[PDB]
Design a protein around this nucleic acid. Structure first.
Ligand code: ZN
Lengths: 53, 99, 64, 77
RNA sequence: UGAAAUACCACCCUGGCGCGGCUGGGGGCCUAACCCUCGGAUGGGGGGACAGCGCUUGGCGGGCAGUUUGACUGGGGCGGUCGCCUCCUAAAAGGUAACGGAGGCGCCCAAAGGUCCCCUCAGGCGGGACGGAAAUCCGCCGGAGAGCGCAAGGGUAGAAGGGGGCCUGACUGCGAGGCCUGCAAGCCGAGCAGGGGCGAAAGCCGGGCCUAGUGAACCGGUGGUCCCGUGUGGAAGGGCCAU
RNA sequence: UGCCCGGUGCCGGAAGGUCAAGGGGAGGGGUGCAAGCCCCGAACCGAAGCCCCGGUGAACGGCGGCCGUAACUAUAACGGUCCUAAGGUAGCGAAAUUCCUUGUCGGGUAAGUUCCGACCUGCACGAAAAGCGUAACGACCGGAGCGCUGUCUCGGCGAGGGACCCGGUGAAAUUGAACUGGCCGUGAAGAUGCGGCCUACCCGUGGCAGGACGAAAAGACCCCGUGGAGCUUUACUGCAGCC
RNA sequence: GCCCCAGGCGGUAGGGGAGCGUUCCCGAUGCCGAUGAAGGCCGACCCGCGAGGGCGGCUGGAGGUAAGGGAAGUGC
RNA sequence: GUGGAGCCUGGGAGUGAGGGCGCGAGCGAUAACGUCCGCGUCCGAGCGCGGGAACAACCGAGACCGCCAGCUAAGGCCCCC
RNA sequence: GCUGGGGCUAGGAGUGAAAAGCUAACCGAGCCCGGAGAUAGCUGGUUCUCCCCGAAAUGACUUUAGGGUCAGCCUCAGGCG
RNA sequence: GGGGGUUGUGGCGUGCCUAUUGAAGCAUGAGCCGGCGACUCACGGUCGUGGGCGAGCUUAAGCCGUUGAGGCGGAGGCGUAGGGAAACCGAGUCCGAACAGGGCGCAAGCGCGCAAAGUCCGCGGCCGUGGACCCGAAACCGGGC
RNA sequence: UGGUUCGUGGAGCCAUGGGGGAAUCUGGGCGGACCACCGCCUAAGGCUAAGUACUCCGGGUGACCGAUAGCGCACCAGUAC
RNA sequence: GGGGGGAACCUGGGGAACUGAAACAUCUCAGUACCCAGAGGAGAGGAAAGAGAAAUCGACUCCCUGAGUAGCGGCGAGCGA
């Protein structure tokens, strides 16, 4: 943890529910991460946008 | 007590609705019963008789639960397990829901 | 004076049929960005306390 | 007089848990080790932390293969 | 004609102006109230809704009150330590004390993760423009003494090391079984199902070579949930999930 | 009665920042068919207080460090540098303060860790918690001298009141029981009580106080108690009080 | 199968079991008691492992109280 | 291997100041009737008994009782004895 | 200045030429009653007999270290064997 | 009349209590005697147990009676089904998509009795609230003197 | 602000210190924030036995005490002191 | 008509702390101790602007139950309808 390595959620781009929580070094990755995670709600893998935790 | 440390009861988490003022909400209670106990009766059985039977406690609405050997009886309960309707209607008994 | 049930225990534990003592697994109220899905998952379920502690707790819930 | 020293981490309780010629059900930890002092082998799995454990049921069979490191085997019943 | 066409006629806005009202703030004056003082008091005088006295706002407030001000400890104090990792202590199982002997951690990586494919180091010697002790190159000798993000250790090239391809399993619901353990915690995990990644497949993938990088519960926040919703429907509010 | 207003306190300040209640109501929400009702509520206005600007020492208080340097040496009038708000002035100074320290020197003494006068290298004086001096004063504390002394060398006698003996009355503290010796050892580490020795006829009276870890007082010194009490404050909270 | 067989029997904290005794309730409108209760003193006598109990002698002069249970202000 | 052995389930505990001795270590000074650990023992609780003169833990040995019986342990057999 | 008489000021209060003194013989907060049988993780004490068994002084955690909760070790009842 | 009293000698022999690792201890207490003197009660819970009844058990307040006589009183409590936060479902329920997998559950005996779930009561152990084994403070607060 | 289980909580209800500040039934209050609906009741005046508490006191009764108990006190005790 | 007294027993105004939370401030102790006022043999309360879910009841008081339940609570201790 750090002020440079922040926490974050991963909303599903479609169900809009934050299904995952992880972290990043915002220094290294100044972009909102986006990763195909299994949306349990949508019940299928789906791109998840990095949402501010 | 645990010699001053945080007691094991307290290191555990609160779980569920604990209610708030003005407190609990009166809703109908279903003292579920089993056919195997109803076998001691004959023909029709009512909630009141079950109350006299020491089975249906007062202030409770009687549901039936699919336990024991059904009996070709006309029971009048506030509700039934689906298994209760299965045994009862299947065993010739008459599942008679009342209100 | 009749005993008084320990309401702090009432809000944490349920006593099963077999006299067992049950309460939720601890450690998932917060700080979870790094915990494993295994971790949150298995911590997400109830469990039966240890024997003696459960016994004491049973003493705390007399009218249960 | 002060001291820099005086601290020590907790005992980890490593080592072999079941020995050769010892019946085990699947899923039992065989060796709680750091690195691979024993390598997984016949019907023997190894988690992320090098922990060896029974894949299938049966009997434990330690076997040293010289240069090829110490292996464990779960010979089925 | 412009992106709109014209007079005139309305809804009106545009800012200003001033008329009034309802205002608020400051001034200045006055006098009954309210406050003195007048031996006279249904009257003088003076000040003047600026005081005093209520309620609440905030603030200053050891004047006063209630209290806290840790433990270990070769007496106490002073100093030091308090939690977790590594090694010895530790007596070939584990565990094992000392204010014993050494160091660390309170993170980091979107790749430093997964998977497929490819390669193998350090070091030494000789040759080689800058150029060296040590750049990059070549050959020769090397099992690992290198490296493996960071402490130590264990492990390791028949890779966990370096590079590339794609990918996000740094999964959901779970979980046989176990280790460890007073408890609680902690740890390993087959396997199953959903749906995927890489791969021809076999297979592996539930983060990281591992062991530190962290904190119970309570209180509360945020999103989902649609579970409860106090006569009814809503709602307030909670519960549960994630956090 | 020197300097420092840098921090604290106080005094003064209409600029400005902040700032509660209150006002205000952009907007937002629940509910209702609607009317409506209810609730949140931003902007902005809005007090002291605070920050901010000043002054303030007979207000709180504070008043440096290093380096070099002159006709032998020494030292440093002198210069350099860094820092501070400022660098301690007069005056005094081994002091009711000097740690080193019984400092040095001089006096006093045969001999003076004390006294007195200087020295200043003041660990750590110092100017209204006043500095320095000071006549008179002191059941104040120092040092010295003279006189006189039973203080003493070093003691002696005597007198009276007790103590001693007799007749009368007649306690008290304390007390495990006692048939209670020394030494050498042992023993919870200091023995009448244990062991080996030795010594000792029973009981008294007047005395001394070595012991009986004698008596007295559940050690006040020390520690502990999540004991109290008193006090302090820029510990926490609150209150009086005050704005 | 009340007796024999084998084994056991140091003991604090402590756990358990088994008894004794004191006051009081039932037994009890009973029974003992002036030919002497309780109580006191004494015993070398008897019972018991013991807590204790009898019995006896003297004092005492008027209450005591069983078996078998119960309840405690119960044992210094 | 039948033992005041073992396991499980319940009730009640006390204990959570230990100490000495031996051995293996740390600290200490290769000092301490020192401290701190591990293994073991004894005392604690066995200051019951014999020896070691005396002496809790050194040697012998686990005290149900009685006996004017016998055999041994350590230790002794010149007197005390 | 001292003293007599007559009075006033009292408890977190009075008074105090100030010592924290005095305030009815013990004043860093009077005395009496009451709360109250305050609390005391501390000290002491805890009363008849016989029998069986028989500890610990360790670990973990502790505003904890002389106290505690769990486990260790005791006993008891039942079951298993 | 075989015993009883005294002890001269010889042997052996470190008061008691507490507190302690350790006391004859020169650690604590006690001058001695006599009397008082400390683990209880209530109400809850839990375990065991003696009995009653038993998928039932069982009453409280009160009422009626005697005036030492009990009976009535079913209000109420416990038990008979658990799981779930809960709605809710139900020998299933919960998580979950799952009928997966798991968690908590459900299966009682013997030969109509034997029993027995449970439950009432007595007894006892222990615990909780009560002052909770007894004595002991320093202290705090109220009202007064 | 107090009472209510209600410790500011979603805080209703009763009460009322402030400041505002109604109407008379189509008026009002309440069913736990609040809105609509559905229902209950009629505030701001007063009184009211009973059934209940206690024992100064009289009486009856005790698995109550028996003069160190029982009341502090059996007696010339709230006394002597 | 009042005054004042009356053991306890009642409201009405005021209203502690010790203690528990193993510290302690919220809290608990407790609206208790105590003070004051008032009564009376009782007091209070008492005839719904109530209860609260049934279209249900029907002043008040007290006993048992509800129920240690709903709840309140540094969601602790506890308190608790
Ligand atoms: Zn989605």
């Amino acid at each position: 943890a750090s002020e440079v390595r922040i926490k974050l959620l991963l909303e599903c781009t479609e169900c809009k529910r934050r299904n995952y929580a992880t972290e990043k070094n915002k220094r290294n990755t100044p972009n909102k991460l986006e990763l195909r995670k299994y949306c349990p709600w949508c019940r299928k893998h789906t791109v998840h946008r990095e949402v501010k935790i | 007590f645990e010699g001053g440390r945080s007691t094991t009861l307290m290191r555990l988490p609160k779980r569920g609705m604990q209610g708030q003022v003005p407190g609990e909400i009166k809703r109908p209670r279903y003292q579920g019963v089993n056919l195997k106990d109803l076998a001691r009766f004959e023909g029709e059985v009512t909630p009141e008789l079950l109350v006299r039977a020491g089975l249906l406690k007062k202030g409770y609405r009687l549901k039936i639960l699919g336990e024991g050997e059904a009996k070709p009886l006309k029971v009048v309960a506030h509700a039934f397990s689906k298994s209760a309707l299965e045994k009862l209607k299947a065993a010739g008994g008459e599942p008679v829901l009342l209100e | 004076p009749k005993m008084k049930t320990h309401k702090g225990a009432k809000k944490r534990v349920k006593i099963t049929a077999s006299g067992k003592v049950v309460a939720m697994k601890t450690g998932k109220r917060h700080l979870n960005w790094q915990k494993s899905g295994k971790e949150i998952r298995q911590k997400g379920r109830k469990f039966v306390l240890a024997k003696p502690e459960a016994e004491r707790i049973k003493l705390l819930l007399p009218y249960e | 007089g002060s001291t820099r020293n005086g601290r020590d981490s907790q005992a980890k309780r490593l080592g072999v848990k079941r020995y050769e010629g010892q019946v085990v059900r699947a899923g039992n930890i065989l060796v709680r080790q750091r690195g691979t002092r024993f390598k997984p082998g016949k019907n023997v799995g190894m988690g992320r932390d090098f922990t060896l454990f029974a894949l299938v049921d049966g009997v434990v069979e330690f076997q040293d293969r010289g240069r090829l490191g110490r292996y464990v085997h779960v010979r089925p019943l």
